[PDB]
Amino acid sequence: GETEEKKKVLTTFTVLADMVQNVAGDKLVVESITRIGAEIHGYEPTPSDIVKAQDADLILYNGMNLERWFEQFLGNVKDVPSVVLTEGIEPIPIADGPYTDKPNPHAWMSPRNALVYVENIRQAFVELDPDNAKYYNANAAVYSEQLKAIDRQLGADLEQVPANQRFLVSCEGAFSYLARDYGMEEIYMWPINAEQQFTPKQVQTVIEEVKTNNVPTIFCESTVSDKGQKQVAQATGARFGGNLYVDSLSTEEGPVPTFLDLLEYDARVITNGLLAGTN
Ligand SMILES: [Mn+2]
Numbered sequence: 001g002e003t004e005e006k007k008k009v010l011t012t013f014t015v016l017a018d019m020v021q022n023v024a025g026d027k028l029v030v031e032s033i034t035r036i037g038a039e040i041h042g043y044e045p046t047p048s049d050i051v052k053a054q055d056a057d058l059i060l061y062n063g064m065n066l067e068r069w070f071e072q073f074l075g076n077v078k079d080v081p082s083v084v085l086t087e088g089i090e091p092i093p094i095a096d097g098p099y100t101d102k103p104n105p106h107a108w109m110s111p112r113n114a115l116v117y118v119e120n121i122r123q124a125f126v127e128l129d130p131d132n133a134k135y136y137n138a139n140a141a142v143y144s145e146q147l148k149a150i151d152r153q154l155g156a157d158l159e160q161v162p163a164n165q166r167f168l169v170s171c172e173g174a175f176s177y178l179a180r181d182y183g184m185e186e187i188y189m190w191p192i193n194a195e196q197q198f199t200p201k202q203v204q205t206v207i208e209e210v211k212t213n214n215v216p217t218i219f220c221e222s223t224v225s226d227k228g229q230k231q232v233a234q235a236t237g238a239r240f241g242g243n244l245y246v247d248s249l250s251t252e253e254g255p256v257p258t259f260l261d262l263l264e265y266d267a268r269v270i271t272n273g274l275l276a277g278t279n
Contacts, residue, residue, distance in 0.1 A: 007129050010056040012067045013040040014249045015108060016085060016117075018259040020060055023121045023139045027132045031056070033073075037222045037248045041066065041193035045073045053077045058128050060121065062086050066105035083124045088116045092176045097191045104192070106246060110177035111151035111263060118143055150260060154267045158182040161274040167213050168270060169206060169238075171220040171229050174246040178267070187215070189228050198228050206232045217241040217273030223248050241273045 007028045011017045017032035024030055033049050034040050053059055054077045061070055063084030074082055091103035107113045122140040126133045158166065159182070168179050169187035179186045187209045190198045210218060210232060219241040220229040226243070233240035244266045250256040255265050 007057040008055065009058045009060060009125075009128070010053055011059075012061045012070065013038075013247065015247070015259055015262065016060060016062060018249055019085075019108070019114070019117060020121050022143050022259075023118060023125060023136055025135055025139045027129065027135050028125065033067075034248070036251060039193065039223050040247050042068050045069055049073065050076060053080060056080055058083075058124060060085055060124065062105055062108070064089075064091060064103045064105035064107065065099070081124075081128070083120065085117050085120050087120055089113055092180060094191045095173065098194050099192050102192075104173070104176050106174040107177055108259075109175055109246060109263075109266075110181050111147050111154060112181060113177055114147050114259075114263075115144055118147070146260060150263055154178075154263060155182055157267050157271050158184065160271050165215075165274055167210075167215045167274070169210055169215050169218040170244060171224045171226070172246070174221065175244070175266075182267075185213075187213075187218075189232075193224065203228050203231055207236055210236050210238050214278055215274070216277035219244045219270070219273070221246055222250070237279075239273065239277050241269060244270065 009020060009024065009028050009030050011020055011032050013034045014032050014036060017030060021030040031052065034043055053073065059074065059080055059082045061067060061082065061084055063086040086107055089107045093101040094104055108117055118140050122136050125136040166184040167187055168175055168184045171189050172193055173186060173188035173191050176186055187206060189202050189206050215238055217239040218229060218233060220226045220243055222243040222245055230240055245256040245262045249259065249262060256262045
């Protein structure tokens with residue numbers, strides 16, 4: 001009597017992938033629809049993506065319209081349970097552009113929020129695989145504990161840059177939750193990823209705001225263009241920080257190979273970017 005196989009949980013992108021894989025341990029086999037630095041807001045699902053979902057015992061997604069392409073994707077697969085890892089989180093509405101004041105989906109950029117992400121991942125696993133409950137709870141318990149610990153570090157990290165200098169300018173406004181948590185003023189080229197290609201007025205606005213605040217370093221993300229941000233960089237003298245990570249982790253090489261890494265790093269390169277470097 002063979003013990004049989006392990007459940008297949010599918011997730012929309014690489015960040016959620018690392019989160020779930022940390023609550024599943026070796027009990028479940030986790031897979032992610034998208035591969036590394038890919039625009040996840042409007043990714044087009046290949047046939048393989050469709051077939052996977054069909055042969056997956058559970059599909060976990062962010063919700064809050066993060067993966068605009070989900071509703072459709074899930075539409076063409078029979079009864080494969082689906083749960084939104086975002087349930088419980090009180091959203092921050094979008095500022096402008098299309099999706100005017102709809103929910104900002106980037107809630108996982110808030111360690112405080114990441115905790116409810118992990119509770120829901122946990123709950124779905126005990127129902128999906130009741131036998132391995134113990135493990136999932138032991139995993140989540142350990143995982144939750146690290147979130148809290150890094151949360152302390154994040155807060156103790158950003159409070160360095162004085163209150164009236166805590167300006168986090170970026171490409172997409174994905175760091176809104178991280179900003180609210182650690183009292184920062186956000187400055188972005190566009191609210192959320194959409195029709196996009198942004199506009200010269202959006203970059204124009206970013207151009208003045210940086211000046212009306214003397215932000216020494218400005219960043220962008222590893223999933224969107226940097227052609228727009230750099231302009232504001234070499235036309236405002238602000239130092240162009242590298243890429244911050246939100247909608248996708250990185251490789252085994254490079255930084256941000258794990259979500260927890262993602263938090264420590266983003267904030268770490270943010271804190272010292274707002275410290276010196278005006279001229
Ligand atoms: Mn995004």
